[model samples]
Target chain A: GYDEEKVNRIQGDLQTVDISGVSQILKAIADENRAKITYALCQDEELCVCDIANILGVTIANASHHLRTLYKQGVVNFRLALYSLGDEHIRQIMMIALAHKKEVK
Target chain B: GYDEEKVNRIQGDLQTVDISGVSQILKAIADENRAKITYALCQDEELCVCDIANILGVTIANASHHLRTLYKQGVVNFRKEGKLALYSLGDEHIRQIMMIALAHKKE
Candidate 1:
């Protein structure tokens, strides 16, 4: 009975974790373009929007939007390196992406 | 070296496991409203939209939308019970939710 009650309590706690936001984070990384971006960043310390756009075959504007969203979500971070391009948060997300990639292969 | 390579490979695999979509799934369940909905269904075999709304203190419309989302995602199933429809995800998700909860406390 105590075990049953304990199980109930634990389920309640897990349900209480910020499940909603967690879903968005997972979804964002699931995209191939985003995964490529994260992978590229992991390889290099920094990259410009143009570089990422070129590598991923996406428009610079589209790349910027995704980068900005990733940055906002704390999945990536950036600094204004110049007028047009900047560095991004590559460490954390890359680790996540790389881990996921390995599991599949 | 092989272990390192394997770790790297596993990490890559985990990253590729639809991380983006997985995030959405976790985020949806994290909400208090949605959690309540899932929790209630685990206790009862099934519930109508109105009963779910009453139990969770959400609007009938809101409850319906949430239920539809859950149903669409295959998180729950439904049946036409007489004039009203009853719904639930009794086994699968409840099991996951319960496992997560236990890891935090009893586990």
Candidate 2:
């Protein structure tokens, strides 16, 4: 229900995106346990498995399992996931959700 | 790095956020079918159940099943037109995530 130019523009945006790539991002933090790991990672820089497990109250193996997934996905590195949450961002949507979650409550 | 003040600030930020909320957003579109639905909904303002089913090349029941979870989780909302239901994105927040993913896809 639009013009040729508009149609093509939208088509291009959709076509250029790889669904699998996006799926990988979602699967990274899709689980509650893994999601918590992201929450901690965003605040702390390169937590050892033990520290993360303590923060999240999970065993080191549980924390390590999730951290391994995030590391492989390239969401963070040795220093910090905190510095990465920029505007128009990847850690951002959840960052916005984090800020807004309090207001909505 | 046992810097006490910095550690306190970090804990406050993490403690303040409701993790379950972000978790809900993730689970909502974690599925390929559901992710596809989010993609289509982002591009098109609204689509009927049959339109969504046909576009996705799926059964009505299959589409409805996913849509139902999306509906309950507040990812989508609908307006009834006679016997037909038209679905639209209820949360703009999720679209922000989608746009970021799309940007990453291109990069």
On TM-score, the candidate that comes out on top is 2
lDDT (Cα, 0-100) at A7 in candidate 2 = 46
**Candidate 2 chain A: minimum summed lDDT over ten consecutive residues — where?**
A79-88
Q: Can you give the lDDT of residue B13 in candidate 1? A: 49
Q: Return the lDDT, model 1, position A56.
A: 56
Assign candidate 2 its CAPRI class.
Answer: acceptable
State the fraction of real interface contacts model 1 keeps: 0.04
lDDT (tens digit, per residue) of candidate 2 on A1-105: 324454455445556667667778777776777777677666654465555666666776887777777666655454332222222355675686555445431
> Model 1 chain B: which ten-residue window has the lowest total lDDT?
B98-107
Instruction: Tell me the whole-model lDDT of each prediction, alpha carbons only.
Output: 0.55, 0.68
Per-residue lDDT of candidate 2, residues B19-89 (tens digit) = 88778777777778788777778888887777666656678899999899888766778999887799998
lDDT of 1 by residue, B2-107 (tens): 2344335435644554545434443444455765677667666787787777666568899999888766545567989587788977345444543343232221
Considering the two chains of model 1, state its CAPRI-style docking category: incorrect
